[PDB]
């Protein structure tokens, strides 16, 4: 296990670049959550009701 | 006390049918809370910061 650690880490780290990378070039790195994403609907909602 | 507490419950009945009164011809029985406020003056100042 101690052998294959180094080269395991290595490539986590690769796996985590691009998914970093990913997340910066399709997303902007804009934070979401579920809460976030409802309350922006009520709203827009709630200004067409209006 | 228990002589005087049949005509004072009649009373007490009477004069809240008058503030029942009131609450009809000045306020239109619109029932009104501080959460139904807070909420509905909240919303306006989205629209009008929308």
Same mark, same amino acid.
């Given at each position: 296990? =101690? $052998? #294959? /650690?180094? !080269?395991?880490? @290595?490539?986590?780290?690769? @796996?985590? @670049? !691009?998914?970093?990378? &990913?997340? #910066?070039?399709?997303?902007? @790195?804009?934070?979401? $959550?579920? !809460? =976030?994403?409802?309350?922006? =609907? /009520?709203?827009?909602? #709630? +200004? &067409?009701? +209006?």
């Amino acid at each position: 296990m =101690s $052998s #294959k /650690l180094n !080269e395991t880490t @290595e490539a986590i780290q690769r @796996e985590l @670049e !691009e998914t970093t990378y &990913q997340f #910066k070039v399709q997303y902007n @790195e804009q934070p979401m $959550s579920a !809460e =976030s994403y409802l309350a922006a =609907s /009520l709203d827009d909602f #709630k +200004h &067409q009701f +209006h």
